[PDB]
Design brief:
Two copies of one chain form a homodimer. Chain A has 66 residues and is mostly beta strands. Chain A has one domain. Chain A contains no helices and four strands. Chain A has a two-stranded antiparallel sheet. A two-stranded antiparallel sheet of chain A has the order 3-4. The first copy, chain A, is elongated and about 45 Å long. At the A-B interface, loops of A face loops of B. Chain A: Inhibits platelet aggregation induced by ADP, thrombin, platelet-activating factor and collagen. Acts by inhibiting fibrinogen interaction with platelet receptors alpha-IIb/beta-3 (ITGA2B/ITGB3).
Chain lengths: 66, 65
């Protein structure tokens, strides 16, 4: 299938709809110019006692903190 | 802003549409019963000279390696 949901997304090669050379991602709160965000970048402000969600340094999603 | 895109998803509390207690995810190739898949679980079969995509153990998406 495709690495980018949209054919407009320049993070993917138009021909293959796979990520372009160098690229690690095409979308998500932890994607920055087709690269993963640095490990520990805050990606979701938490409320109550909960810790903030942070980037993994190895994926483009913002995960629940673990 | 909900942690699950579907109201039917039992990984999320129906009242808040946030993850249920203990839950880490509700969707994705690296989610297994509302928990993250073990680090290094293969989530995408690669072709040519490329390594396979593996689960991080810290997220529910299957990332590029």
């Amino acid at each position: 299938e495709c690495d980018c949901s949209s054919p407009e997304n320049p993070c993917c090669d138009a021909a293959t709809c796979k990520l372009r050379p160098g690229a690690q991602c095409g979308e998500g709160l932890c994607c920055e110019q087709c690269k993963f965000s640095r490990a520990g970048k805050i990606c979701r402000i938490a409320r109550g006692d909960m810790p903030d969600d942070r980037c993994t340094g190895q994926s483009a999603d913002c995960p629940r903190y673990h």
